[PDB]
Design a protein around this ligand. Structure first.
Ligand code: CA
Ligand code: CA
Lengths: 747, 751
């Protein structure tokens, strides 16, 4: 032989030969992506599904057998949330979350993470990951901040670009490449209240200004699929948003990839957004809008068939979507090799030493040292003879008390979209306890022979009660507090590991207050009051408001969810076996009502502060300490006048005036002095990592293409306007940390 | 003539004759509305100003003298912020803030307020007030929530319509009518962070949906002027926003009134929004956009002139603005009679008994009882001596001696009680000592005057709110004060009732003064905790600009009264309410959040959210739009829609039955919400469309008719059109916007 089965026949002819043989239910079936947890049998055989997601290892094997019993034997696309590692394969390598990864400011490293993930994913027979996430974290109340690369469009684009390259490899014939997904297109991350898929009050120009740029980048770089957002934007759900899908994605960007909806997008237009009277009309709307894959709306099957039968849409529209789906399957070679799981390759590559080394590198470089009174590195810093550290000169016996609810919690350390986080039902125990080094594990393994490591839980966070169940913050626990206070009073250092956990994170779980829940604030107050130096380690999904006692503690480390090696990286940082390198990809609010606290705030406000609160963030985008001092000086623009096709070139001089080496992340912001429409005060446009030995000075070149110095004007065009600009260069987005030099652009 | 001085000549010909006589500097100056506090001499003589604002009584007189010395003697328009009463005339009747007035749900009363204001304003020689405020209070962080009529577009339109009607009177020849102003057109109230004039991230459709309806109403009803907002909206400041000004205001609505910017709108485009390189280009851009009056951008004078000289804009563009301004002045009769202040008129009408009586009625009907465990009315409620509707209350049966301890920073603060835009609030510089003390009854005053002869009223401050420190200065919350709390605790332990009067004050309110936390600042939380723990029943009275987060102790107190800023008679109303001398009638025009991060907390939330709560916090507001108690129980029953067919020109008619099942009379406010069941684009869960006040004697039942025109059952569709879409609707009727309080009945609009 049949021509669609002949690999010598051109793809377009194979597609036409198969399409002409399909019944309409078989064609509608190809548009369906169904939840395999509900039973692969009916999905493959009765609904003729084109794709499955959340397919357990036993159901992947069953799905291939079922395909063999179908009339046309069209291979399935098996898709999965493989979000920061192969989230739902027991024993896979689980990396930090994207938010954690973004603190490395290292696209080359993030590409290694994505490539390592795809290698593991491919060995399990999954073809397609719903990753990377390109949402921009502009309201910290949102439950899914942990899934973003932070608050900056340029850095998001850098790191999402790296993920797509790493996942897709050499292309559709690469055996270790998988399809990437640009999600969640677009505007999902900034909706009313920071709630999950509440209304997006985002105009066309606002979306173009702060949300689209990373999506346009990965579209142009060949991201195989896009996922359409759950949310209504200016009253129109993305699933039927013609401006966004046709004018922007297909038209302005010329995108030729394949679309998939988010979970039950089509159905939600009936029962949650209340914009369609029934499933037939919602199905017709989704077809008319140009959707391809419809994720987990089972009733699209009968709804689209009735819509065609009633003349609401043409069978030709179904054909157009199936043509695109079949083209993808043919180009992946799935009719010749359906890419079944391979046990021998799973044993060779899943959680390989290779992959664990990448994971350790990301964990080590993601930790952000936010405050330090000199207590760190502890006892002046330690040396090794990998392996246990030696007691340093002048500190033969020390005791480190490791306390707090997140100090020994391996599930919470890995975060959402991993293990037992809840979206997959075949990982009851999550990932093997084996594979995660908690903070307590890390200190127990690295503290010198001669030092002691003690543990006390100190505080609980929450319990669940009936109304899904609702969170009940843990009560005061004087006995639990007093046990941790006793450990600290008998210690030289108290390492308090605090944060959030899964019931306070993710879909349907935005938070209003951003505060530590349960007994954690009381624990931190009591610990600091002992006079033993306290290091607060925040293991949490997103930036939290920390209590006054955390700001009075000796040091504060931000770890996001640092993955399987995170606990080793934490102990190494505290003990000085590594230098800190992480830099914040996101700003920390002092109060939920303080927002916006992202750095790229649009100008115009009457005043600089709330009457009851500063507008200065607790910690700002790009901030983060090392164990040395670095002086920035002598920022110069080399030729200040520019035409549109030129490059802004600059130099700055850095000096390591301290005693330890550093990898410094130089950050380059552009400010547009006079804008035709109101605009951000500044935006990150470039950055550079610079290694500096103690006492070393270096003059490093910097550049920003003039073409990147854009704004979105009143006509919705992203343009460089002639006029004055400032280049702002320094170690963070804090204005008092930035050198500045003027430049101009002329027509 | 000369023809422009000839009253027999038609207005259009008078305008043309005068325009032809004017130099270009005098035409540009006629567009200027300058701050009289900086000197009326230069403003009138050197800059040929067409208008002044913030003009002190002495400067009003001097301004008329200076006008007679100018070449053409063009009379000035004198304008003022007369925001709730004649704000900055010492001894005027100061009413509750607009937000307090809105709790009455009484447009007829609000019209009386505005007409009484206008009478007093006209006597002082001011022609034009920058009122009413039509902003919608959708972010409680915003500092200017006190100036709004709350969070609901329909109720805002109702009350703003009333204000414009009362202000303007019989029209441009009415000696007691003044020009009203629809401010701040539009979207100013919902900007990033709830900050003052930060960026408004508002699409055309969102603006049409929730912000424009009150403005469209008063535009069609003849509001003489509109004021352009300070904010940049989708990147474009309102001052140069062609879609809003040309397509909507002048185009869709056909509005023919006069425009004025807000304060230094044009200059801010240079120094604060950074969208114009210099003042000549900002001036040109303001002129091109069709601006009329330019408020407090003095450099517009030289800016516009240089813009004309460089051909950036045509002198004909200046001519067009001057024609509209001069036409207004001619139709006001200002060339015949410039409406000078009149001292005899001032003595006769300002703070008259009739105006004081309107004020007391608004104060009484505006208070909102939010919680009551039975403690109120105190001691079972009191009566006055028969035939004495004004004297002390009589001690009741079984309670010969009771002591009421009045405590808290706002218990005896007559300035904070009047609120922003009044007295010494700060925008005027000629009344450093505020309005006369005798005109304001504080909460302490009210209890002292009304408590029975054998009862006692004690006072203790209990808590301070703030002090100011050098960097304007910054707010420093008042530190813990154990001794002050102990004094108030001792007073409460030695009393039968503690009335704790808490809230905010001027440094936490208004322009440049949004708040992040919405909490009570200073020692107030500590005071409330300590008071409730005494065992003496505590009534919390909130005198504040806007809804605040109240601590758990306030929710454990015996009763909570919301007073907003209740004006000069507010303290009498509070005492009368607590003692049962009046029944509570107020109903919230705005919802109260439990935390700033809980917002949106307005009732008309757009559908679509995955989930119902935050993981750490309910989404239920502390108190919801429309809530408010009386001193009796009212059962709602048997909601019925009348008829089956409802077409585009029909009225949906319905009936509901109310029964007063308790022991005291009530004026109940029945609220009528419409819910559009299936919508072409996502929409609010429900919207208020009607209400009705019903008086019920004890035990009385009434079947009450309700109606909503089908043409009011609109949404704004994907094409930016406000339309009624055929399909199913739900009518929801009850005593508040709480879903568990609403009866509901379906209806269908045909088509
Ligand atoms: Ca510029
Ligand atoms: Ca409808």
């Amino acid at each position: 032989t049949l021509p669609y089965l002949d690999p010598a026949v051109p793809v377009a002819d194979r597609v036409e030969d198969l399409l002409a043989r399909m019944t309409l239910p078989e064609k509608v079936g190809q548009m369906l992506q169904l939840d395999a947890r509900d039973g692969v049998g009916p999905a493959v055989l009765e609904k003729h599904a084109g794709s499955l997601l959340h397919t357990s290892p036993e159901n992947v094997l069953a799905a291939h057998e079922l395909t063999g019993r179908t009339r046309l034997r069209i291979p399935l696309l098996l898709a999965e949330d493989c979000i920061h590692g192969h989230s739902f394969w027991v024993g896979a390598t689980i990396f930090p979350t994207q938010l954690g990864m973004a603190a490395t400011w290292d696209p080359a490293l993030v590409e290694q993470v994505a490539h390592a993930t795809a290698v593991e994913v491919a060995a399990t027979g999954v073809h397609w990951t719903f990753s990377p996430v390109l949402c921009i974290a502009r309201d910290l109340r949102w439950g899914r901040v942990d899934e973003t690369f932070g608050e900056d469009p340029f850095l998001i684009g850098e790191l999402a670009s790296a993920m797509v390259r790493g996942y897709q490899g050499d292309g559709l014939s690469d055996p270790t490449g998988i399809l990437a997904t640009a999600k969640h297109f677009a505007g999902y991350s900034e909706t009313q209240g920071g709630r999950d898929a509440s209304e997006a009050d985002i105009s066309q120009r606002k979306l173009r200004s702060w949300f689209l740029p990373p999506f346009e980048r990965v579209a142009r770089e060949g991201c195989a699929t896009f996922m359409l957002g759950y949310q209504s934007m200016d009253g129109v759900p993305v699933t039927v948003n013609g401006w966004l899908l046709d004018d922007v994605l297909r038209g302005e960007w010329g995108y030729t990839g394949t679309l998939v909806t988010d979970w039950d997008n089509v159905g939600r237009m009936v029962w949650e957004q209340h914009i369609q009277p029934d499933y037939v009309h919602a199905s017709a709307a989704a077809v008319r809008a140009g959707n391809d894959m419809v994720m987990t709306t089972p009733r699209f099957f009968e709804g689209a068939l009735e819509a065609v039968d009633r003349g609401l849409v043409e069978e030709a529209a179904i054909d157009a979507a199936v043509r695109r789906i079949l083209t993808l399957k043919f180009r992946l070679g799935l009719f010749e090799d359906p890419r079944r799981p391979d046990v021998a390759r799973q044993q060779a590559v899943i959680a390989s030493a290779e992959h664990a080394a990448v994971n350790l590198e990301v964990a080590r470089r993601s930790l952000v040292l936010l405050t330090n009174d000199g207590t760190l590195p502890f006892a002046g810093g330690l040396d090794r003879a990998d392996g246990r550290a030696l007691a340093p000169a002048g500190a033969p016996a020390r005791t480190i008390a490791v306390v707090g609810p997140n100090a020994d919690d391996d599930h919470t350390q890995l975060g959402d979209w991993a293990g037992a986080s809840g979206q997959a039902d075949w990982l009851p125990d999550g990932h093997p306890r084996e594979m995660t080094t908690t903070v307590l594990d890390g200190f127990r393994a690295l503290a010198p022979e001669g030092w002691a490591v003690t543990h006390a839980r100190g505080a609980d966070i929450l319990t669940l009660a009936p109304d899904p169940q609702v969170v009940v913050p843990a009560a005061p626990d004087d006995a639990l507090i007093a046990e941790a206070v006793a450990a600290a009073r008998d210690a030289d250092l108290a390492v308090a590991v605090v944060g959030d956990r899964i019931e306070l994170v993710g879909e349907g779980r935005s938070t209003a207050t951003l505060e530590l829940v349960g007994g954690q604030v009381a624990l931190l107050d009591a610990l600091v009051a002992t006079g033993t130096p306290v290091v607060v380690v925040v293991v949490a999904s997103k930036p939290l408001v920390l209590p006054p006692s955390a700001h009075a503690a000796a040091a504060v480390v931000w770890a996001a969810n640092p993955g399987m090696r995170g606990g080793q990286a934490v102990a190494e940082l505290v003990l000085g076996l590594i230098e800190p390198e992480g830099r914040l990809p996101i700003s920390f609010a002092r109060h939920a009502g303080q927002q916006p606290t992202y750095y790229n705030v649009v100008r115009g406000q009457h005043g600089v502060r709330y009457a009851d609160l500063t507008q200065s963030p607790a910690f700002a985008f790009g901030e983060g300490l090392s164990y040395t001092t670095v002086e920035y000086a002598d920022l110069r623009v080399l030729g200040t006048e520019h035409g549109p096709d030129d490059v802004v070139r600059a130099e700055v001089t850095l000096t390591n005036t301290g005693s330890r080496p550093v990898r410094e992340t130089v950050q380059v912001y552009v400010s547009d002095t006079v804008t035709s429409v109101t605009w951000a005060e500044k935006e990150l446009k470039a950055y550079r990592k610079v290694d500096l030995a103690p006492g070393e000075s270096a003059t490093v070149g910097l550049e920003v293409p003039v073409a990147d110095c854009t704004l979105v004007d009143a006509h919705g065009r992203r343009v460089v306007e002639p006029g004055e600009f400032e280049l702002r260069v320094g170690p963070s987005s804090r204005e008092d940390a930035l050198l500045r030099a003027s430049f101009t652009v002329a027509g």
